[PDB]
From a paper:
We also collected two independent cryo-EM SPA (single-particle analysis) datasets showing multiple PabRPAs coating the ssDNA by using a poly-dT100 oligonucleotide. Interestingly, 2D class averages reveal that PabRPA dimers adopt two different conformations in the two datasets. In the second dataset, PabRPA-ssDNA complexes are more condensed, adopting a pseudo-helicoidal configuration. 2D class averages show additional density for OB-1 that connects two Tri-Cs from adjacent RPAs. Both 3D reconstructions show that two PabRPA molecules interact with each other on ssDNA through the OB-1 domain of one PabRPA that packs against the Tri-C of an adjacent PabRPA protomer particularly with its OB-4 domain. While their OB-1 domains are similarly oriented in both types of oligomeric forms, the OB-1 domain is more loosely packed to the adjacent Tri-C in the relaxed form than in the condensed one. Differences between the two DNA-bound PabRPA oligomeric forms are due to a rotation around the OB-1/OB-2 domains of the Rpa1 subunit. In the condensed PabRPA filament, this rotation brings RPA protomers closer together, compared to their position in the relaxed linear filaments observed in PabRPA and SceRPA17. Importantly, in both types of filaments, the DNA-binding groove of OB-1 is ideally located to route the ssDNA from an RPA to the other, and protect the DNA from nucleases. In P. abyssi, we observed two forms of ssDNA-RPA assemblies: a relaxed mode with PabRPA molecules arranged in tandem, and a condensed mode with RPA molecules forming a helical-like structure.
Numbering used by the authors:
A (entry chain D), F (entry chain A): 62 to 174, 186 to 358
B (entry chain H), E (entry chain B): 3 to 180
C (entry chain I), D (entry chain C): 5 to 117
The structure:
DNA sequence: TTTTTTTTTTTTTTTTTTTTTTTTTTTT
């Protein structure tokens, strides 16, 4: 079939339903109550093809039959499913007794859908784990963010409300930004932490940081100047600390490689010593 | 660019040959006895004395002992804050620029923080691993230098054996110093 | 110019006559809160550690850096630094001490300029 | 309460309109590894079996339990269970199918309470 | 003693009349439509669905279809192990005690193992043979029951015709149920 | 003595052997080769009393001493002979140095001269073939056995050696014991398999079973408790399997009928179907 | 031909802010 997800519509003939999609998301299986009082199972996934996305809902025995067999990145082919309108007005694929799923199908539409040393890191690197020393603190600041998309919100003086360009009138949350450098003995890389991860490393609340930023701005400093000053004056104590950062490396058009850290954690010393023992064995020490 | 901080024993820093760059913007560096060019140092030791803060707060300093040597760590002006952080007895990790004052090598503090005793163990393991890695590479590079010197032919031979071109220049510079 | 002599890492049973400043790691077995002294056992021996101000707790694993005092009553250590080594992997420390003992003299002797 | 309908044993040529779940036994003659379909020949006909994950080999004797799919392209079986019937005595199976056909209705009709 | 596991069609178990013994030690049994007293069942079918193991491992179950009916097979506590053995599509032979839950007959797994397709054929042949043997014996026993009932005279007549005394009691019990 | 030929059994005390028999057959004397390379003589006769027949084997000087003195129809009395099992499983009388024969004695005895259903099985049944389902697993264990007689060997802590009561100092072999139940639809019977037959059915080596038994015993279980536990925890997979067992039925004074299986084999489905067809023909089906 | 001995049975389940990287020298 040439059918695409964009062509699905609620109530279309299940006999016409023939789409493929790569799995983007898998949600946990849930229980639901039937009209007769019994309890069934239901599980949802999000798939996408070259045209759009669809929620795929596995019902009852279809959960046991397929749910554990499917993983993110896999492609599935869906046949004979009922199409329903989602709560947002979009088509969803319901996998009931009649429906079938083919895991990693042979279909022409399919083609159309780690510890690394800093010296080896490249631009665009994904899922990189780097263990090193905090060497520099560039900036510490907090901004008002949307609680859903975490993007910067704008204060409207005419209406007295906070406006998110994606979600409209929202209640803002304080988001912490920590920019620092990390050294592993073979290289140096810039690192950025956000919100809860940054607050955990800094050991200071975002509301307290906002108050200190306000005091600096009142003195005649801009937001840029106040952020650099607070990092040097109050958060210099964090320098010299050995940590493990995990994230993706983006290349700034002048700042160079910046590691956007998704998480940070304390060094597992026994794990690190075992890595060193492996290297020593390779050198003919042990 | 920003070059790496090399993890070393204090003894290796102390016994090294400090090189003062004549340019007002060029970074100073040290060449160890094993031909290792070091711009920044990364050491793990114990603060042996209560820090020294000048009354006028112009400088702050503290002493670090790692078992192989004892070195002073200095912070100037507002950088005196680094010395105020530590206390006698703290087990710390220090990163900074190597400096030489009164023909005695020292560390110009860039960062100092308290570490867990297992970090001191990890530091010793890493320091020894890196040292062996470097010595074996420098031994092969020294043979290349004694046979060919710094020529286009020797640079090709060095790359084939996993040796950086910079290593041959360090050997030549060390021979010039000695 | 009496430059500070680095603390020489030793076991209680391996302390030498020529040693003036040492680093010992053990478990506290007795604390005398009146004479400010404590008994440190490392597995190889027991040393009497005279402390000036910091007294550890009984059963605490500690690292002591001190000057050796040789008198008619025996050899006691005047503690300079006492650190909490309670979560320290002494098995790993022992292994690195043996690696340094074997490999450090060989690395220095490889220099044939 | 839609209780699972037992698989009705049939020959490809004897499949009825009212049949929703069937059991067929035959030899694979063609396997399409891209559309996940295979051709099963039992001696009485050829059925196109659409499989979800298990694809047999060409020339393999297999037993298929599946739901019948009736569309504009014809009648294809969506395979639920595919079993290896390679060492199965189909001569004996055919003989027992005839024995059950003859004797089962007579046994039920013997009840005169 | 330990009575036999009767080889039957799933249909015969499903259409039967389960009898719960009031005693805490008495075994439960089923009486088929052809007056067959069954304490244990021996069936051969295909596992139609991937097994169901409760997250808390308190129970494990799997479904078996033989062509004449579909029945659930259950193992509790550590007996959940029986359900873990099988997979969707396996052709298996099951032996166990007949149970009734929610007025639906089921099999409390005592043993489950994969069988060769010729075993399924052998099972069908044996099931039919035993069924004919039983029906003919029960037909003669029913005539004895309708003429004399459960008397000392009818028990002697039953033994002479190769009928067990227990068969007359099963007929009487079945008449009481219906 | 009142002893009869029917009462002889292999290995019975030669001092108890006292039988009479009339000579039915005399075979020619033969030569045989001894273990030392020399050649001896041996001659056989068949005798019978009011109870049965026995082969009488005259060895070496007993041939010269008695063979020509005996004739068909004569009665002999046999004393102090060794009793052996013949090649057909029957008692034979061996007339060696110790044995005696009395020709035409004065004795009061002189004037007097398969496939089975479990429901049909009796105690003491021999060579019974039963096809059924494995229904229960009682115990799985291994013991140190003598490689000759296969009996349990004792470890002597004083000498550090393994002692067989029949063969002395021996090298022990691990013997597997499998106790289970078998059901044929008409009855239930207990079954015991040994060594190679049990290992073949279990699909696990005796050394591996010994290791698992050791782990269970170390936990605080006795040998009895550990054997029952291993059968339920690891060998429960064998239950539900259809097999053919052949053996002799012994009656335990509390456990009931136990079938000591000499061998086990997979079911020959065509052979079984033919047996069923025979039964169906008898019922008037075909 | 073998080890060691007490047979079986009921009931339990649902992706972000905002953007110009690094560097020397100063010490009671
Ligand atoms: Zn938003
Ligand atoms: Zn023996």
């Amino acid at each position: 079939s040439l059918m695409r997800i964009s062509e699905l519509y609620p109530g279309m003939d299940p006999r016409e339903v023939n789409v493929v999609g790569r799995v983007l998301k898998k949600y946990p299986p849930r229980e639901y109550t039937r009209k007769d009082g019994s309890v069934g199972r239901v599980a949802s996934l999000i798939i996408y093809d070259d045209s759009g996305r669809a929620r795929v809902v596995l019902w009852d025995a279809k959960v046991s039959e397929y749910y554990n067999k499917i993983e993110v990145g896999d492609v599935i082919k869906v046949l004979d499913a009922q199409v329903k309108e989602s709560l947002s007005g979009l088509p969803e694929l319901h996998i009931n007794f009649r429906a079938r799923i083919i895991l990693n199908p042979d279909d022409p539409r399919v083609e159309m859908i780690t510890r690394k040393k800093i010296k080896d890191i490249e631009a665009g690197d994904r899922f990189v784990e780097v263990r090193g020393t905090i060497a520099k603190v560039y900036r510490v600041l907090t901004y008002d963010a949307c609680p859903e998309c975490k993007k910067k919100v704008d204060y409207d003086e005419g209406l007295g409300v906070w406006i998110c360009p994606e979600h409209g009138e929202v209640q803002p949350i304080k988001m912490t930004i920590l920019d620092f450098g990390l050294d592993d003995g073979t290289g140096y890389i810039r690192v950025t932490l956000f919100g809860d991860d940054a607050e955990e490393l800094l050991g200071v609340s975002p509301e307290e940081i906002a108050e200190k930023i306000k005091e600096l701005e009142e003195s005649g400093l801009t937001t840029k100047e106040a952020a650099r000053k607070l990092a040097e004056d109050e958060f210099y104590n964090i320098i010299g600390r050995e940590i493990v950062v995990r994230g993706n490396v983006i290349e700034d058009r002048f700042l160079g490689l910046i590691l956007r850290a998704s998480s940070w954690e304390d060094v597992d010393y026994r794990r690190e010593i075992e890595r060193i023992k492996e290297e020593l064995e390779k050198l003919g020490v042990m | 660019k920003r070059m790496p901080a090399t993890r070393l024993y204090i003894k290796d820093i102390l016994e090294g040959y400090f090189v003062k760059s004549e340019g007002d913007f060029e970074p100073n560096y040290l060449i160890t006895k094993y031909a290792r060019k070091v711009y920044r140092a990364k050491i793990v030791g114990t603060v042996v004395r209560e820090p020294l803060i000048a009354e006028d707060e112009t400088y702050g300093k503290f002493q670090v002992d790692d078992g192989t040597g004892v070195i002073w760590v200095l912070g100037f002006r507002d950088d005196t804050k680094f010395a105020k952080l530590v206390r006698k007895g703290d087990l710390v990790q220090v990163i900074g620029k190597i400096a030489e004052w009164r023909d005695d090598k020292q560390i110009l503090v860039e960062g100092v923080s308290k570490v867990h005793p297992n970090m001191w163990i990890l530091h010793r393991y890493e320091t020894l691993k890196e040292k062996i890695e470097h010595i074996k590479k420098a031994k092969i590079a020294l043979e290349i230098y004694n046979q060919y010197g710094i020529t286009a032919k020797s640079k090709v031979i060095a790359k084939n054996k996993g040796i950086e071109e910079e290593l041959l220049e360090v050997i030549d510079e060390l021979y010039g110093i000695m | 110019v009496r430059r500070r002599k680095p603390a020489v890492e030793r076991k209680i049973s391996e302390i030498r006559e020529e040693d003036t400043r040492v680093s010992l790691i053990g478990r506290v077995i007795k604390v005398d809160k009146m004479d400010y002294m404590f008994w440190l056992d490392d597995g190889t021996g027991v040393a009497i550690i005279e402390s000036e101000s910091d007294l550890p707790k009984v059963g605490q694993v500690v690292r002591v850096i001190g000057r050796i005092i040789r008198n008619e009553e025996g050899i006691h250590i005047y503690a300079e630094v006492i650190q909490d080594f309670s979560d320290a992997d002494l098995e790993a420390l022992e292994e690195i001490r043996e690696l340094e003992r074997k490999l450090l003299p060989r690395l220095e002797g490889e220099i044939v300029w």
